[PDB]
Coordinates of C-alpha atoms and ligand atoms in Angstrom, one line a residue:
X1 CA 4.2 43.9 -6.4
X2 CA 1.6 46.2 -4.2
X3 CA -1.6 44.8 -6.4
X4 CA -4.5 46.7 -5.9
X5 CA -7.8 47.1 -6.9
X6 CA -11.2 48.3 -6.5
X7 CA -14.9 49.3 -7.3
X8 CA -17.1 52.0 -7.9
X9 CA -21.5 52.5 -5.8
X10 CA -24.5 52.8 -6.6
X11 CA -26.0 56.4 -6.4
X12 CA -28.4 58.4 -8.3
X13 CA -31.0 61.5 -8.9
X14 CA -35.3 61.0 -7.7
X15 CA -37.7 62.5 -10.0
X16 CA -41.3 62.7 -9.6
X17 CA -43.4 61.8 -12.4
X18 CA -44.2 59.2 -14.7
X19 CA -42.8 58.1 -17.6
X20 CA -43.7 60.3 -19.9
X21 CA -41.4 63.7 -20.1
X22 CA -37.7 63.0 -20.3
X23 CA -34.9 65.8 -20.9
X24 CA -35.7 69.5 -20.8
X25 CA -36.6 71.0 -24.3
X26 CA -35.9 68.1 -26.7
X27 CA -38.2 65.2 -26.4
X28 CA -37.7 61.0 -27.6
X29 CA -40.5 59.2 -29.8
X30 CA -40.5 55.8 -30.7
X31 CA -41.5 54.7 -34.3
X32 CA -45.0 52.6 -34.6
X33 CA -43.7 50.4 -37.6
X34 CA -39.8 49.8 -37.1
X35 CA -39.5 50.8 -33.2
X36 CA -36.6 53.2 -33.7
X37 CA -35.8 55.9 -31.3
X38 CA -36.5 59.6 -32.9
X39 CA -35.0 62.7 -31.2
X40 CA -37.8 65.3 -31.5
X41 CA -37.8 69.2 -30.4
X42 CA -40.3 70.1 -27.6
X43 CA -41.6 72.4 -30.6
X44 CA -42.7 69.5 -32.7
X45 CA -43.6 67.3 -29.4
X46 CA -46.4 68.8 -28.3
X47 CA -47.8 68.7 -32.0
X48 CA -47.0 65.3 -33.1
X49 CA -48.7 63.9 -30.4
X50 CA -52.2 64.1 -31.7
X51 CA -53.0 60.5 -32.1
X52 CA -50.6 59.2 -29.5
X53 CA -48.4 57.5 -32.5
X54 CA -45.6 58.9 -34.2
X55 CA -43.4 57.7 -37.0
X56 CA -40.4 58.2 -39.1
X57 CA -42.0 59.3 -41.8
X58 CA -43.7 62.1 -39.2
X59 CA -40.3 63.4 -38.4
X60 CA -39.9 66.8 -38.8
X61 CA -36.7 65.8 -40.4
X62 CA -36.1 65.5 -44.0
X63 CA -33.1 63.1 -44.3
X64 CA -34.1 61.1 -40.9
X65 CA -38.0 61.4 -41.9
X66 CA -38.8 57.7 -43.1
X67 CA -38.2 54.0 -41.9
X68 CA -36.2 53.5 -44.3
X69 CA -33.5 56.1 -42.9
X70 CA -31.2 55.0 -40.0
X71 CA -31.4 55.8 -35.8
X72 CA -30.0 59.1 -35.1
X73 CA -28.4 57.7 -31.9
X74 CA -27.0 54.7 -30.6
X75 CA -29.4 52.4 -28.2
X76 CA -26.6 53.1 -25.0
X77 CA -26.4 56.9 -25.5
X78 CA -30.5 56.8 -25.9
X79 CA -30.5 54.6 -22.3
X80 CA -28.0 56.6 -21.0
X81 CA -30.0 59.7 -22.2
X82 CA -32.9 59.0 -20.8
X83 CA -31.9 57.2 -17.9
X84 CA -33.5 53.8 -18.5
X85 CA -33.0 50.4 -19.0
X86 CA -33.0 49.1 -22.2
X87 CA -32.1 45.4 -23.9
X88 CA -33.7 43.5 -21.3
X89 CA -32.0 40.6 -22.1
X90 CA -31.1 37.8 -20.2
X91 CA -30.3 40.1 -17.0
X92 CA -28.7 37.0 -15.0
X93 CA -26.9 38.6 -12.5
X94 CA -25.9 38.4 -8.4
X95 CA -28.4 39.4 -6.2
X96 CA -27.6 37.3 -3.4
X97 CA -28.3 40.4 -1.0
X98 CA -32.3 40.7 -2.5
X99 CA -34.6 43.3 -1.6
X100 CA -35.0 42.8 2.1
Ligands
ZN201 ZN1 -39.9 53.9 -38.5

């Protein structure tokens, strides 16, 4: 038996901004009374933001336009999306190495 196995790296893009612009065109808002994740055009974006809170009910949706409606993605394709970090969790892990 010739076992074998191995791993993948760690490797990634450098922006330069803040948080605060994500993707290209399409923008993300968060909900201020269920904290759900709303896919928004950039049409809408630069509208909605007038009071620097947004919620479902704001959408610019009609089926997906209230809390009482469902996420229109899942939490993974919304980290991956974005590029962030979310469910903090416990976030026990190796780290034997540290920073330096
Ligand atoms: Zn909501």
């Amino acid at each position: 038996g010739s076992r074998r196995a191995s791993v993948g790296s760690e490797f990634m893009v450098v922006d330069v901004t803040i948080e605060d612009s994500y993707s290209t065109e399409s923008a993300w808002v968060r909900c201020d009374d269920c904290f759900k994740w709303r896919r928004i055009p950039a049409s809408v974006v630069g509208s909605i933001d007038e009071s620097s809170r947004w919620i479902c009910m704001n959408n610019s949706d009609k089926r997906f336009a209230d809390c009482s409606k469902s996420q229109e993605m899942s939490n993974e394709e919304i980290n991956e999306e974005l590029g962030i970090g979310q469910d903090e969790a416990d976030a026990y892990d190796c780290d034997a190495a540290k920073r330096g």
